[model samples]
Target: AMTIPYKEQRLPIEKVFRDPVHNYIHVQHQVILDLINSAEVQRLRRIKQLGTSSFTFHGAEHSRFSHSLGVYEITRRICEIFQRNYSVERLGENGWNDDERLITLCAALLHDVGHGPYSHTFEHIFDTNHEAITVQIITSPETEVYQILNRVSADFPEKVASVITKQYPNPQVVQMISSQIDADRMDYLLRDAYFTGTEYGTFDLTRILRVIRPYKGGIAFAMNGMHAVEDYIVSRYQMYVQVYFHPVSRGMEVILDHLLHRAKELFENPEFDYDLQASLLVPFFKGDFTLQEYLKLDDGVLSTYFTQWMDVPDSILGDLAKRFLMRKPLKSATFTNEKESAATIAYLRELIEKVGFNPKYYTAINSSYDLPYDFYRPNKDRHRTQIELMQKDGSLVELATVSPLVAALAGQSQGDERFYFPKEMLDQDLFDETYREFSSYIHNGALVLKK
Candidate 1:
């Protein structure tokens, strides 16, 4: 009774996308090819995959479009491996169902389709969620992506959307598209490292695929493949610390965040009349935008507005936008003591204000944290699906229990907290008194109580 409606509609010949990370991304299904060409999917081409990280690592100019294709390629290979070695005909209850292939691949490709310019920064200012919007794009009748998926079957679009919501009945299909060690993370790690020109994210993808297998519960790796999985976990951990969490990138992100926030505030002021200049963003500035309007924005659109805002009548807005457009990242000092951090930030804000800067728009406290690996904990608010390894005796054991390397990082949060302010405070030539006082509280790259 299980069947994929359009499985026979293959391309006349396989299509290939030349890629630096994957080398080549092969497309076989007609539906897959059509979805890739859809307007919603193509919009990802203008959205930077790393956002602010690209400012820190100039080589990271890759887009979400390329990353999505990489995820699709990885998922396609996963389907091949699963069907070849773990088909239901071969392993019954714990085997892969060939019927699930199309949905899995589709979900992988559209996972980040809803991401907007400077994703998290935009989301924080506008209160939009990329994940929820991704589901909307897939299920909405107005979207080409939804229309194409609806052709598979009337309910197919909803089915695919459910996978993103993690409500799909097929655990294997859901996990393949979204899990601790799924195609999304796998491709981004490799792709990000390749673009950032860093060696931290490099891992054994071939070995990972070779040992990955499906079980009744979800996807798992063979015990022999523990080392490969371990390598992946460590590699991901390294990328987050070295590249994704770079302070300069977060500095740029802060500028963008404050710039957008200021724009929204000014737009709401009755006397402000820059409506025509920011016509495209007016809906978001007012907190009421449709999917069509949302689709129209990209990194360039936001950057263009930033350029225009550089000459605006509002000095704070213009200066923030100018800072963002000109790549002037804020200076920050790491702070560990929360109690002292509050007082330190307050004093820094006062110092910045004394130098003709608005403390509210010129200062921020950013804390970045990531759990390298975590075992499943049902009682937790946001539980992460744990990675499992299948033993030779047909038993399943969680990864950290057997691997000391993983255990050391399991459930441990990594990263730091820092206070951000205008870089001018650091220039002794501009403000000697403030610079000396500011330097007194900052010692060895950290905010410390003045001795």
Candidate 2:
């Protein structure tokens, strides 16, 4: 008997997940259904969606599970849009090929699978690459995600994994997943906006989806829908500054970083007495962790250890954990580019030290930055596929060229650098001469180190 291929298997009836961001996420194919239920995919439910963004936006308690499913739904919608209006057979070499649908959908579902607990801070502390781990989870036969993909074909997992790494042979699949205007960005912008209850990330998803069309090279938008696309770009910019890079949230991220870093030191330093017994984090403590070991961790695992860690003898670790678990975010001040220098940073650290905060653990020069848009720039290192708008006469124009809004933002970095410190430095009631001096320091956006 010939074995029916995995992609050929369809659910008797659609399985729908009720998502707050998207009304209903429809699952039709049996392979998609199985992959969604796979242990590796289910692991996402334990992971936080916005890392530690909940520290600022209390409503952002959403999980990667929701975002992953949302991404799949958006990709599914894009697939439907392509098949309806941009079929490859009609447009010959320049249209969307329906054959790529399964792989694209699979890629979308598993793209964020590798994100660990407190992904950004964890990545910095452990030097873990979520993208690389995502590829590993897909290609590694040991994973349920890989096993499900393997059912389609032995090479199918690799094909899906390539989409995350931007090495997929098909530009359409790569751009659809990773482009400036792809399903992932589209979903997260809207999803993050919703969960955080911020209007900054709001965009007309229906309009953008309608404008999107697939081409042999990649995806483009109809010129008439340029305003909708612009709305998305600006929304993304606003979200980055407002919601994603909220100073309070970011300050806590720095604390989380210090907590992890201090723990690593206490674990590794022979001079310090420590017998940390969290088995799942052993590999990470040693600076090399396996995917299997990584699977054993989540926000809960770390929170448990942090709770116990507060009882440990290490002052720095205990303080950081209390700060994190108690929502005591560090204070932050914005300094202009002209004020940035070795002397300025050194002076700032000195001031923090004088205020009785450990400069090493108590301060960070956190610069959260992003480029809103890039249009056909000829820079060697920063070459980006500019967003193209298809004109009525069939010519494609770069988005920046046709729109003043995008042009103003194109090739420009949009964010600020912040000097983060312990909030005690600003407490006048608890202050003396040094604290008073600290107030005098921020006079011209420059702080006094000490007397």
Candidate 3:
């Protein structure tokens, strides 16, 4: 007997919250209850979904927990839509099978479970991949997440893990959760816009969802939803430019990258005995961590350590910790590979060092780019999962081939290059006499003065 878990219901029948994008999100599954209760999954509550974006968008304080739930809710609705309208019997080769539903839900809920504190910032410093770590958490026996999943069947956990790894046999299932217009991206765009108080992310999700259908190769959208899909792609591009790639957040991330690198370097020296606020991080430093050690970390744990490091004897470590904790973001200037001059970088570095800051640690060149939208190219080493539209004549066409907007962004990177440096370098008090030299170098060489 296939029994639904009744105990998972909210006290008041688990009411649906009306959202502008999703409309109504209903939660009612026992496995979901158990999965959410697991400590491994609950840890996402402390990890911000958008990382340092909140530094730019003050209202962007939403956590990975919310995003994960949102993904799960979106996937759940997608499954229902598939089952009701496009089941195998009714739609032949284009129908969705109910059998793949559980794995889809599990994958959706646990997708971001592996994310560490500050996400990409930590990953850049520590050489960690959240997607890889997420798979480890789901498959490893050391975590409660794996334990809960194993309860369904011995191989159930691997089945779910495959969904994340994109090795699941069913292309439709994998595409539903991971393709160009997957549940994960859909939820984050809407959720992020809601929390960040930005209308740019507002797209017609209802229209998009309604148009979604499964085919033999993967999922596709009806031609009618082309506008909604285009809106979503444009919204994503705008968010990346306006919010995700905000200069302030990236500047802070550069600071964080340097801080963590400096800390790791200091810890390597036998004479350096900094306070051990992050005892769990010790194994990572030694490069000998078990799944258990990885599970022991989250944003709160790292933040606690940063707070304690504020009082440490190491000046650089202590200062950077305070800088990060206090939201003292480094300033940045725009640059391009074609425009920046070597002489200008050297001049700026000298000025930065003259003011008692190490250019190596305080200065960085960050490049952010996105393939905004693209059709699948077989020759490319890393092919994007292109959006496909199914024709009435049983044909599949890449979205960009038909849509002019998508075609314009196809295979094009959308981002810019920026040079990061300490805000102190811009201070006139320190470099009063050399201000002209500094300004000239920055303007002429770094900024590539138009005139």
Candidate 4:
């Protein structure tokens, strides 16, 4: 039997950073040090933690690097507590295993490694999934991440990747990293709230950590800490509704989505010159990028390219680039699917074009919603992992079935469909009485036709 080596050393004295959320982050492990120094991991510094959410909450300038570290820290603490209280050999089927600690730690650290520049916005345009990229980064031989993990053991990298994919045999390990109320979400909620300067995410981290423990098949909270867990669920819901899915951020995403599409469109045009500044993006534009090429991109590199595009001759591309770079968020309004008839949409599109805006590029419909909370309904078309509470009898109970607060949001999506258009749409001078005909068509035309 091959035995893994364990080393104990005093925590690094010089590496503590004071944070409002975690209080003080202590960097100790050499593996963590190498992971943080890896080029792929460092690339996270350039991706915004919340994408265009900074357009709404200006203080939300935190990077994925910070959040990754926060996740790692939370996981590390959980591992320590588990080892102290619940070792596999000691507690048989009900206890956490010390052997799973390193893989869980690695998974928590590298979970967001695949996030591209601007996160979801880039994913929207490029059809990239960050989660898939994360697995690829760990398994692909070309990355430093893969190389580092392989040094620990031949199967170590896959073990780490499996945790993120939720395919690992250990449910406790998977839940620690990706469950409904896991280290990843816990870290982000607290970290994002601290950065965005919001009180909504102020949950009892200490209490939650203390209550977290390994159960028969997976991780669970002690019934005593149920309120702390409840607070976390509510906090997550509030953060999504009030912060993550804010319409202004969605408006900015509209601008980004359209801007990238326009750039992609121009890239394919024979008459247009692919700017030299976007040479780095050529492979991505061509839909083929090596791991090295992907690592080369960060928010700064993308922003620089956007700045260069501002000077490009394509009016639409240049203007959208400028708008994104200068923080000119698009305007958005709530619209119902029933209220927006085909004719109303056509009339609005024509009026928008008449006002000198390219309707196709400047206008969009963004729908943002979330299940908020749910019970695991396997028969449902869309199944959620759902929060499960462990009872004193060692049986699992679904949260919504027991908690009225959670039940209120169960299976209910909280968000709206918004019609995004040029900010000038709100200008009285631009869309006065003549355009009011079009505006009225959007607001009341469907009702009149139904009557």
Give the TM-scores of the predictions, in the order they appear: 0.95, 0.93, 0.90, 0.90
By TM-score, the best candidate is 1
Q: For residues 6-122, what per-residue lDDT tens digits would candidate 3 score against the true structure?
A: 322333356464554566666666567678789998888888887777888989988888888889889998999999998997987658998777778888999888888876777
Task: Look at candidate 2 and tell me the lDDT of residue 275.
Answer: 67
Write one digit per residue (lDDT tens) for candidate 4, span 16-56: 65666787766676566678889889889888888888888
lDDT of 4 at 39: 85
> Residue-wise lDDT of candidate 2 within 271-341, one digit each (tens)?
98876666788899998878999988899998888888888887788889899888999888776663444
Poorest 10 consecutive residues by lDDT, candidate 4:
371-380
For each candidate, the alpha-carbon lDDT, in order, equals 0.86, 0.82, 0.76, 0.77
Worst 10 residues of 1 by lDDT: 370-379
Candidate 1 per-residue lDDT over residues 1-451, each given as its tens digit? 3454674478878999899988999999999999999999999999999998888899899999999999999999999999999999999977999989999989999999999988888888999889889999999999999999999989999999999999998888988988889999999999989989987568999999999998888888999999999998888878877888889999998899999999999989999876538878999988999999999999999988888878888888888888988899888899885676787678778888887888888888887752222333222333335788899887988888888888776555555888888877776556678778877877787887553
lDDT at residue 276 of model 3 (Cα atoms) = 55
Clashing pairs in 1: none
**Alpha-carbon RMSD of each model:** 2.8, 2.8, 3.4, 3.5
Query: After aligning candidate 2 to the native by TM-score, how far in Å is the CA of 94 from where it should be?
Result: 2.7
Candidate 3 or 1, higher lDDT: 1
